[PDB]
Amino acid sequence: QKPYKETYGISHITRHDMLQIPEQQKNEKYQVPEFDSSTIKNISSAKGLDVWDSWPLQNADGTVANYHGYHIVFALAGDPKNADDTSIYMFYQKVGETSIDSWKNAGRVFKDSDKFDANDSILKDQTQEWSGSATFTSDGKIRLFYTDFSGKHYGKQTLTTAQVNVSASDSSLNINGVEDYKSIFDGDGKTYQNVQQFIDEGNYSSGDNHTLRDPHYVEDKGHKYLVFEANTGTEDGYQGEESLFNKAYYGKSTSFFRQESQKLLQSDKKRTAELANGALGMIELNDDYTLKKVMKPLIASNTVTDEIARANVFKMNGKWYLFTDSRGSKMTIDGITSNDIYMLGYVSNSLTGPYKPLNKTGLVLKMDLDPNDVTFTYSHFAVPQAKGNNVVITSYMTNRGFYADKQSTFAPSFLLNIKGKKTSVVKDSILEQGQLTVNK
């Protein structure tokens, strides 16, 4: 194949930038701080469940919502013995509280019968509930977005919404049920890969990794959007052999492209690279949360990786910040190892871009602890704050199903300082397990 250059009008996580990270990540400014294992507790209200990917009920701008005097956190949870047992639970605390012990368990958001009652063809085939976001509407409603995963249809993932009906009293929150429970998006083939395209490759035995998940709600000028993990489609730079010859995915220069592409083509990562077409996608929603417009991706990770997760975007002090998590074990970059796990980050003057890398390369957080380490954290997420130069990094701690006595739990939160196009972890800024705000 002849070399070409095509950006598809979107931004790109380039090979050149990623290659800088292994030396850069030695700087403590970009490192998840070490945590103290003897302070770490299980979520007492979750009663022997693993509790992993979690997200706060947020206002439209991403700040933490106050629901009738409570903060609310949605989280994936299930039986540590069963890797395919995943549903969304709703935890809550009185505003002002900070201890992990303050988190009460309202139980599952959904009943098993809800997917059938929804009169929704895709939803009735769901087997697991995976990650997303939740916004607190202007009329006082809890509006959930999440990923409908279908195990029996080759891992189809569908962006899905529901309103969660919750009664509030002085002592408790109670889930009464849901409504407006519906599929919104399952890809379109041209902009974002769909499940049929995954099946076309031979599904799981192909080595391809199909994603359409982790929907994150955000507004700008009263328009409603989801930004989500996806993969590219046929018209915005698809996976394939020809993709490795696109200079846009390399960056730097033609000299770098020639050197790096010939190495990649000669390596045991050629096939992985060819399949790698991760994207942070975007759609606009209507005022009833249905699909208005499929929009071009904010960024893609062709050749680098097929998996950029926990999409997140918000405005802070006049700039827009875009984040995603990614595992070193699924990347194709010399010097990035299987221990390495990142939060990457990008900045724009506008919500819809273009986005350039934070800290020159995209690196914001690095976490490289052994999977066996009790203090291992994952699914890092920046929670914006009402004011100031800090956001709060939440994550889950402890790998699923690893220890009988220590379940996946809320990690100790910490602070990340953001100014202009640079970030740094705030020295000794470790907060309580699962703490969402600086203010108390």
DSSP for 43-75, please give it. Answer: -GGGTT-EEEEEEEEE-TTSSBP-BTTEEEEEE
Q: What is the largest CA-CA distance in the chain?
A: 68
How many C-beta atoms surround the C-beta of residue 409 within 10 A?
A: 25
Cβ proximity of 324 and 229 under 8 Å: yes
Cβ proximity of 308 and 301 under 8 Å: yes
**Burial grade of 205 (CB within 10 A; 0-12, 13-18, 19 or more):** exposed
Task: Please state, in angstroms and rounded to a whole number, the distance separating the CA atoms of residues 425 and 390.
Answer: 9
Which amino acid belongs to residue 389? N
Task: Please state, in angstroms and rounded to a whole number, the distance separating the CA atoms of residues 246 and 411.
Answer: 40
Cβ proximity of 425 and 408 under 8 Å: no
Interior angle at CA 426, CA 67 and CA 320, nearest 5: 60
DSSP β-bridge partners for residue 216 = 227
Q: How do beta strands 87-94 and 70-78 pair?
A: antiparallel
Task: Tell me phi and psi for residue 245, to 5 degrees.
Answer: -100, 5
The method of structure determination was: X-ray
Secondary structure E strands in 330-399: 341-348, 356-357, 363-367, 377-383, 390-397
Q: How do beta strands 409-410 and 390-397 pair?
A: antiparallel
The CATH superfamily holding the domain 1-434 is Glycosyl hydrolase domain; family 43 (2.115.10.20)
How many C-beta atoms surround the C-beta of residue 408 within 10 A?
A: 30
Q: How do beta strands 156-168 and 173-185 pair?
A: antiparallel
CA 424, distance to chain mean position in Å, is 20
Interior angle at CA 229, CA 279 and CA 251, nearest 5: 25
Which residue, 332, 334, 337, 395, is CA-closest to 365? 395
Cβ proximity of 75 and 42 under 8 Å: no
Which residue, 59, 89, 97, is CA-closest to 73? 89
Per-residue DSSP letter, 77: E
Resolution of the coordinates, Å: 2.1
DSSP β-bridge partners for residue 300 = 12, 279
- Domain ranges for the chain: 1-434
Task: Please state, in angstroms and rounded to a whole number, the distance separating the CA atoms of residues 139 and 142.
Answer: 9
How many C-beta atoms surround the C-beta of residue 232 within 10 A?
A: 25
Three-state secondary-structure class, residue 434: coil
Which residue, 139, 12, 144, is CA-closest to 75? 144
DSSP β-bridge partners for residue 64 = 58
Task: Please state, in angstroms and rounded to a whole number, the distance separating the CA atoms of residues 73 and 71.
Answer: 7
Task: Please state, in angstroms and rounded to a whole number, the distance separating the CA atoms of residues 331 and 319.
Answer: 29
352: left (phi over 0), alpha (psi -120 to 50) or beta: alpha
How many C-beta atoms surround the C-beta of residue 110 within 10 A?
A: 23
Residue given tokens 């080759």 in the structure block: 154
Cβ proximity of 74 and 54 under 8 Å: yes
How many C-beta atoms surround the C-beta of residue 398 within 10 A?
A: 25
DSSP β-bridge partners for residue 12 = 300
The two tokens of residue 338 are: 């299987």
Task: Please state, in angstroms and rounded to a whole number, the distance separating the CA atoms of residues 261 and 29.
Answer: 31
Cβ proximity of 91 and 106 under 8 Å: yes
Interior angle at CA 134, CA 59 and CA 299, nearest 5: 90
DSSP for 325-354, please give it. Answer: EEEGGG---TT--TT-EEEEEEEESSTT--
Secondary structure E strands in 96-222: 104-108, 128-136, 142-150, 156-168, 173-185, 213-220
Which residue, 349, 356, 223, 222, is CA-closest to 282? 223
Residue given tokens 């770098």 in the structure block: 256
Structural element, H or E, at residue 279: strand 278-285
CA 365, distance to chain mean position in Å, is 14
